[PDB]
């Protein structure tokens, strides 16, 4: 275990090393709505997309905590990069549910392979000899422009067209065609465009049931390494929350950094630190962000402990983790509003990084897996053993 | 009084009549960072910049409540337009502190005259024969590109250069030169650029002491009409809050309008109205916005009552009004965050008006006169008769 | 109308006149869990139980606003008295749904008649010749010990025992028997004991359908005076909220009164007013209480306007009023927690009135008609025209 | 270290073993305002007052985390007992700053010795031959009736009467005289009465400077065991917060336990679990309590890590811990208000444990060391290196 703490220290140190490159390409990504080439280069050199890739394929093969800690530091430099990087690892982790044939095809000669994934069942597939024929239109395809493969969920149907089952299908970039639909006010460089397919062929070995994609049966398998025992869907939500969290932490640091050089208009306080109302308010806001940090870590640690222990997390724990992530990001978005008040009107200038953290965090926070209202109802429901209101845990 | 309620109904009806024009020019203003010509035309035709202009100059000469109600409806169509319109009236109201010579020069042949004003003392003036010589750089000059005059606050100095007093100075557009400094993520079309002057001459009749600009001695003057008895600085803050409020109300209406046609991902709720967690949350959020509405109205009514009654508002009332406006906008920005949660990820699309209300309201809310933390300390301080932490009330 | 504002001023002045008597009997009522005789005397002398009694029976016959304003001032002296007084008027207002025979029997020779009422259907009634035979056990019978009659809701059944309909039944104190069940930590003097009946006879003229008790058909009846056109159930909730509100306002006044004579342990602030963190926080807390005040008044005014105008309030307005009252009391209970923080450890001493307001307001706030969560779901539901989750409006 | 986790499991198991006795004496303690004899017996048998007593004196000598975890479970049975128990250990820990002579006198033949302590400098002491002469009146003396000694802070003065320095003085029960001043609405059995002294003699060996009482110089001393390297004042605040936290957790468990057997009046929801508005709200409230739990643990772990590592905590860390404890208890008191709303009117019945947790937690939370507003200003101030607003850290 002392190894995994040491590795984290190195990967966090890499983010600081490569950070300047990510920070350098912020303006272009905002402008173009995709990651600059220098950034993608840096992501590939740094191996930050390989944290949840297996060691057998030359990956780093870390744990949930390490990915989270890396995510939070990355968001300081560029929230979009942090979001793409984390979604790639999460997508790479989900690919471990596919057969060895698929995994070998994807990672065999590509240690730094990068996957996209959209779980919304936006397509229909039919049985054809040797595999499936897939058609659909999948929005919110994060980082699809730079990814090698994509995991797409679809609804299987028969010759007549009646639904028979859910599928999770791994298709390469060569078969992909991407529509430009990502025009947003935050997380712009994420390039979460729509993936389109039209009668695209997918072989048997690169298709699993959606029922098997959600599986946590690997939790008790001693043959697998700890990482692949982890509850992947929960783990993905945790690291996504870390991206949002990290942006909020950067917003706090900035407001602290600039407070002694600014006043509170139109008050007598020429310095923001001179106002004890400002200081206590900032102390309060900081403690909310600290709570969100403790929330994300609690969940990350629960997933890591169970993975190493090779025990299956009960539904109640998974339901609680979904509440933790929703609560954490909800605290951050409220904290950001409080930080804009603390800073003042200059925060909304395009030259100011504060509005950038504000916009990126707020946009990313409304990801399905981070829904605070759904999270509350899930966690609240676990106390009475009610039916989960979401299909996947 | 039944007249002033009838007039409001007509002016609100005008906003709806001209609204389509304002709504039509939203995309261009966002792009260009200034109001389209059709909008400025509509503002001049509608007389919405003449609400706080005197009847003797062919103005409408209404009251605080009416301006507020017009402001809130305007924000539905374009928050930037609402902000410019309201700042013009407020600036026009502040001009009534100047001598008749200035007022005649400004409004004599221009019933629809539009003033800018920045109160931050960003310039220095010296005595010269017949007037003053003024130099400075004044940021945040709202709607300056379309305005005829500008009220600029400056610090008077002597031949040696030692501060002697504060001044409020009315200078025309012909003497103005505007720097392009307004690059923001919200309230973009407001064109709050920097006003620059360099050894510009201002005559005696268009200069008053800053000490007289803040004056509320007109409160008891029965010679003046009610409007000009009103506490102008307080009244300006109230209508500014109305702009922010109105945006929040439009955000609420939109979320209500779209809820039955959307789901809550990734939950079983295919319709947002099917979730009672969604409905109660929306009910709660709506009640916060309702409180902000009641806050702004309370203040508006206090100012109007005293103006018609010809009584001077004590400091405690003015201090309370400053708390009301800060509280109202603080509730709206928090409510907007809650509405983004209610709506979901689609809210951050550029095609969606929700992120537009969100950004515009949040940017405008950090106006000095709307500072929530300062407002709290002011109102709290009035309970114990502490010294106000702001110079103007 | 200038009369009803003048009358309010007098009735508020009466509360101050008789206030010392109510304040004098606080300690005894706390001890004995019922109102002292001096208090009941004062209630009868002051006519504060006759505000919603008809003028034809020698009552004051005021409006919702006046009752609310009286309620808020009463809570300063003794919250329990305020609660009893307001419940009596509300119960007296509900009696106007009964036939003239009942009203004459109740108010004919008793202008200062005081009714109790519990709406929870805790009893069953059967048809007998000339009336009904009633049996049941009704908890939460506020002020029953001092009341002359009681309005009890029951479920009608047949000889076999199958439910047939809902009833509202007016029975006198002579037929009542009261069980001592009111052992609480707040609102102790309210004496909300359980009313018990056993095969008690109730004649036809003192029984109406529960369906007619909830009726708002009197809203458009020009024959009735304005008061009896008012939506009684909504009006009762509003004045109940006023009792809770008034306690919160008294808590605020006390904290303001004592702040300059106390410190903030263990800080350097020997005076609470010396801490600007304390002052701004108090300013914030005060603004929440101000919002609750504006909420209650908004609702009161909506009910009064419609009553005088003789128009029926649509469900949406009534649903909104239920949200207003729940929001108002929710703000007050949160504000009280904030005021305890402001004051400090001395607040929880039995000698300190602050913990008394705290306990009384918190207990009363959980009245069914003041349920904040139900209120939110009701008001939220009105936006989409959903079925109300409560039977009565 | 695996020992200290094992010991905790046993001490938590002891609280459950002896819990029934504490729970049994709740009604009497509430009535009499002091701990029943069976409780004091149980405290002495269980060794729960000996957690922060040295092993050399036959104590358990645990750490901050263990005391905290024991505190939280104790509050389930009786919050007052938990508060007394924790204050005794904290007082016993502070006694380690005194010389060996004092420690031997106190703990030499009394392994289960129980100390009181009040830090408010409410007394004056003068130099006399062989020691000091002490006079004063010290309020809030928790558990003084059952304690063997008391640590009292005083101001040293000269023959003339001018202040010279601060003192911390250890005096036995034989020299104590206790005034009955503890009449409160929560934490009643704590018996926090006033300690009075009149020209009482205190020898040199049982007196240290207040300057040495606050000392953290023991942090780096490898001669001392880890427990006595811990920052005692910070550690005391942490365990006090644990008492409040534990009460809030018990309130949550109760509301969860009773929800399926209760309805939400006056709604259609016959069961509380049937309302998804109730469930999500409870989920939200639970997450606030979870945050407070994570706050207290974070602080406890920071103190324990530094103690075992033998490093001195910088001021910034100590300032942060003071923010954590204030935030945690602030979350709990707000959470309790939310839980009363969830439960309903039955919560305020004297027979219901919910109002007991509510009152006890709220009273205890206003302890100086748990002041949320002071905590915010302290933690906020650490970001800019401002002077601490409290004398002790
Ligand atoms: C920046 C961003 C990226 C997202 N990426 C993905 C993704 O990669 N895969 C996915 O399944 N869902 C993703 N989502 C989920 C998406 O938010 C929901 O499906 C969304 O709520 C759909 O509703 P709508 O409002 O867009 O219509 C993402 C959301 C955001 C904001
Ligand atoms: C959209 C907007 C318009 C503003 N317009 C004006 C104005 O017209 N006049 C003025 O005096 N101040 C105005 N202000 C005030 C301005 O916000 C403050 O002076 C500001 O806090 C200065 O601090 P800074 O952070 O910009 O540096 C405006 C602020 C905003 C956000
Ligand atoms: C102080 C108080 C007085 C109340 N008085 C009445 C009343 O007079 N009539 C009534 O119908 N309901 C009254 N209620 C309503 C009562 O709160 C609800 O019926 C309650 O929620 C029942 O649930 P329970 O938790 O008591 O069980 C009162 C509540 C309180 C706290
Ligand atoms: C239940 C309780 C116990 C307390 N016990 C102690 C104590 O043992 N020692 C101490 O120094 N302070 C203690 N305090 C601190 C006390 O709260 C403060 O000194 C208090 O704020 C003094 O202000 P006042 O409002 O009582 O006057 C305690 C407070 C409470 C509520
Ligand atoms: C939930 C679970 C897994 C996922 N992979 C990509 C998106 C996404 C959402
Ligand atoms: C405060 C008072 C008046 C003002 N006029 C323009 C800005 C502004 C701010
Ligand atoms: C709701 C409506 C009317 C009522 N009368 C007494 C209680 C009560 C509750
Ligand atoms: C702060 C620090 C230490 C203490 N001991 C007893 C009370 C108390 C408060």
Which chain A residues have a beta carbon less than 8 Å from that of D343? none
Q: Give the binding-site residues of ligand 7, using a 6 Å CB cut-off.
A: C 90, 94, 117-119, 233, 236, 369
The answer to whether the CB atoms of D324 and A282 lie below 8 A apart is no
- For D260, name the nearest residue in chain A, comparing CA atoms only: A384
The answer to whether the CB atoms of A183 and B268 lie below 8 A apart is no
The answer to whether the CB atoms of B184 and A373 lie below 8 A apart is no
Six token digits for residue A226: 């700890």
Burial class (CB in 10 A: 0-12, 13-18, 19+), B303: buried
B87 lines ligand 2 (CB under 6 A): yes
Which chain C residues have a beta carbon less than 8 Å from that of D264? 371, 373-374
Q: What is the CA radius of gyration of chain B?
A: 21
C320 C-alpha to ligand 7 centroid (Å): 18
Nearest CA to ligand 3 atom 7: C118
The answer to whether A237 touches A372, Cβ cutoff 8 Å, is no
Could you tell me whether strands C131-141 and C193-203 are parallel, antiparallel, or unpaired per DSSP bridges?
Answer: antiparallel
- Residue D361 distance to chain A (closest CA, Å): 21
Alpha carbon distance A312, A302 (integer Å): 11
Alpha carbon distance A229, A224 (integer Å): 7
- For A278, name the nearest residue in chain C, comparing CA atoms only: C277
Helix (H, G, I), strand (E, B) or coil at D128: strand
The answer to whether C164 touches C173, Cβ cutoff 8 Å, is no
Q: Give the binding-site residues of ligand 1, using a 6 Å CB cut-off.
A: A 87, 117-120, 140, 142, 187, 190, 192, 363-364, 366-368; B 265, 344-346
Q: Give the binding-site residues of ligand 6, using a 6 Å CB cut-off.
A: B 90, 94, 117-119, 233, 236, 369
- Residue D8 distance to chain C (closest CA, Å): 32
Q: What is the DSSP letter of D40?
A: H
**Could you please report the per-residue DSSP string of A237-248?**
HHHHHHHHHHHH
What contacts B49, CB < 8 A, 6 or more positions away? Answer: B43, B85, B88, B89, B92, B112, B114
The answer to whether C101 touches C129, Cβ cutoff 8 Å, is no
D167 C-alpha to ligand 5 centroid (Å): 62
What contacts D161, CB < 8 A, 6 or more positions away? Answer: none
Which chain C residues have a beta carbon less than 8 Å from that of A276? 275-277
D243 lines ligand 8 (CB under 6 A): no
C362 lines ligand 3 (CB under 6 A): no
Helix (H, G, I), strand (E, B) or coil at B117: strand
What's the helix, strand, coil split of chain D in %, to 5?
60, 15, 25
Q: Any alpha helices (H) in chain C, and if so which ranges? A: 2-24, 26-32, 37-46, 64-77, 79-94, 100-107, 210-213, 232-258, 276-309, 315-343, 353-365, 372-382
C119 C-alpha to ligand 7 centroid (Å): 5
- For C274, name the nearest residue in chain B, comparing CA atoms only: B386
- For A341, name the nearest residue in chain B, comparing CA atoms only: B366
The answer to whether D15 touches D70, Cβ cutoff 8 Å, is yes
Any idea which ligand is nearest the CA of B236? Answer: 6
The answer to whether C87 touches C120, Cβ cutoff 8 Å, is no
Alpha carbon distance B134, B175 (integer Å): 11
Residue C301 annotated as binding site: no
Alpha carbon distance A329, A333 (integer Å): 6
Which chain C residues have a beta carbon less than 8 Å from that of D187? 348
Closest approach atom of ligand 3 to CA D262: 27
Best mutation target among C383, C385, C387 (most B Cβ atoms within 10 Å) is: C383
Encode burial over C61-79: b for 16+ CB neighbours within 10 A, e otherwise. bbbbbbbbbbbbbbbbbbb
Residue A271 annotated as binding site: no
The answer to whether the CB atoms of D348 and C337 lie below 8 A apart is no
D170 lines ligand 8 (CB under 6 A): no
Alpha carbon distance C122, C136 (integer Å): 6
Chains that touch D (3 or more CB pairs under 8 A): A, B, C
Nearest CA to ligand 6 atom 9: B119
Alpha carbon distance C319, C378 (integer Å): 6
φ, ψ of residue B209 to 5 degrees: the values are -70, 145
Would you list which residues of B are annotated within the binding site for FAD?
A: 87, 117, 119-120, 140, 142, 262, 265, 346, 366, 368
The answer to whether the CB atoms of B371 and A275 lie below 8 A apart is no
Helix (H, G, I), strand (E, B) or coil at D165: strand
φ, ψ of residue A325 to 5 degrees: the values are -65, -40
φ, ψ of residue C163 to 5 degrees: the values are -55, 135
Helix (H, G, I), strand (E, B) or coil at C387: coil
* Cα distances (Å, whole numbers) of residue B372 to A269, A341, B237, B382: 15, 8, 12, 15
Alpha carbon distance A131, D52 (integer Å): 68
- For A292, name the nearest residue in chain D, comparing CA atoms only: D291
The answer to whether the CB atoms of B380 and C323 lie below 8 A apart is no
* Cα distances (Å, whole numbers) of residue C306 to A251, C4, C52, C224, C301: 50, 16, 17, 13, 8
Of B275, B286, B278, B265, the C-alpha closest to B345 is B265
D369 lines ligand 8 (CB under 6 A): yes
- Residue B21 distance to chain D (closest CA, Å): 42
Alpha carbon distance B282, B328 (integer Å): 18
The answer to whether B98 touches B206, Cβ cutoff 8 Å, is yes
Could you tell me whether strands D177-179 and A115-128 are parallel, antiparallel, or unpaired per DSSP bridges?
Answer: unpaired
Residue B201: which region, alpha, beta or left (left: phi > 0; alpha: psi -120 to 50)?
Answer: beta
B345 C-alpha to ligand 5 centroid (Å): 14
The answer to whether the CB atoms of A287 and D383 lie below 8 A apart is no
Q: Any alpha helices (H) in chain A, and if so which ranges? A: 2-24, 26-32, 37-46, 64-77, 79-94, 100-107, 210-213, 232-258, 276-309, 315-343, 353-365, 372-382
User: What ranges do the domains of chain C cover?
Assistant: 1-113, 114-209, 210-393
Alpha carbon distance A318, A340 (integer Å): 34
Alpha carbon distance D74, D372 (integer Å): 23
| A125 beta partners | A134, A156
- For D343, name the nearest residue in chain C, comparing CA atoms only: C366
Q: What is the DSSP letter of C313?
A: P
Q: Resolution, rounded to a tenth of an Å? A: 2.9
Helix (H, G, I), strand (E, B) or coil at B182: coil
Alpha carbon distance C338, D330 (integer Å): 9
The answer to whether the CB atoms of C280 and B383 lie below 8 A apart is no
As a CATH number, domain D114-209 is 2.40.110.10
Nearest CA to ligand 1 atom 28: A367
A249 C-alpha to ligand 1 centroid (Å): 23
The answer to whether D152 touches D169, Cβ cutoff 8 Å, is yes
Which chain D residues have a beta carbon less than 8 Å from that of A278? 380
Instruction: Supply angle C-alpha B2, B4, B10, rounded to 5.
Output: 110
| A150 beta partners | A116, A171
Alpha carbon distance B64, B301 (integer Å): 7
Which chain C residues have a beta carbon less than 8 Å from that of B283? 323, 375-381, 383
- For A279, name the nearest residue in chain C, comparing CA atoms only: C277
What's the helix, strand, coil split of chain A in %, to 5?
60, 15, 25
D254 lines ligand 4 (CB under 6 A): no
Which chain D residues have a beta carbon less than 8 Å from that of C372? 341
Q: Residue for token digits 């095609």?
A: B351
The answer to whether the CB atoms of B345 and A330 lie below 8 A apart is no
Which chain C residues have a beta carbon less than 8 Å from that of A280? 277
The answer to whether B71 touches B239, Cβ cutoff 8 Å, is yes
């Amino acid at each position: 275990r002392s190894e995994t703490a040491e590795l984290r220290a190195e990967l966090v140190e890499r983010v600081h090393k490569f950070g300047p490159v990510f920070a350098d390409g912020v303006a272009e990504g905002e402008r173009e709505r995709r990651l600059p080439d220098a950034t993608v280069r840096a992501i590939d050199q740094s191996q930050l997309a390989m944290l949840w890739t297996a060691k057998s394929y030359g990956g780093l093969e870390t744990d949930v905590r390490t990915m989270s800690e890396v995510a939070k530091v990355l968001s300081h430099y560029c929230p979009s990069t942090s979001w793409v990087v984390n979604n790639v690892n999460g997508s790479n982790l989900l690919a471990s549910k596919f057969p060895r044939a698929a995994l070998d095809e994807v990672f065999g000669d590509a240690p730094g392979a990068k996957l996209a994934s959209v779980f919304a069942a936006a397509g229909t597939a039919v049985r054809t000899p040797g595999g499936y024929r897939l058609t659909g239109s999948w929005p919110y395809g994060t980082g699809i422009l730079h990814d090698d493969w994509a995991i797409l969920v679809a609804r299987e149907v028969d010759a007549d067209g009646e639904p028979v089952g859910g599928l999770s299908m791994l298709v390469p970039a060569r078969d992909l065609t991407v529509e430009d639909t990502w025009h947003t006010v935050g997380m712009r460089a994420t390039g979460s465009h729509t993936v389109v397919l039209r009668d695209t062929f997918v072989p048997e070995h690169r298709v699993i049931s959606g029922e098997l994609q959600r599986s946590r049966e690997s939790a008790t398998d001693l043959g697998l390494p700890p990482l692949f025992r982890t509850a992947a869907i929960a783990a993905m939500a945790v690291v996504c929350a870390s991206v949002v969290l990290g942006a909020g932490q950067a917003a706090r640091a900035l407001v602290v950094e600039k407070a002694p050089t600014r006043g509170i208009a139109p008050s007598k306080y020429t310095r923001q630190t001179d106002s004890r109302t400002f200081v206590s308010s900032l102390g309060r806001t900081a403690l909310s962000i600290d709570a969100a940090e403790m929330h994300v870590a609690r969940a990350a640690t629960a997933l890591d402990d169970a993975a190493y222990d090779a025990v299956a997390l009960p539904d109640s724990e998974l339901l609680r983790i979904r509440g933790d992530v929703g609560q954490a990001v909800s605290l951050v978005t409220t904290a950001l509003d409080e930080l804009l008040w603390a800073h003042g009107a200059a925060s909304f200038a395009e030259s100011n990084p504060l509005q950038r953290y504000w916009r990126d965090a707020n946009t990313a926070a409304r990801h399905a897996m981070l829904n605070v209202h759904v999270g509350h109802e899930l966690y609240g429901g676990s106390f009475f053993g009610l039916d989960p209101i979401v299909p996947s845990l």
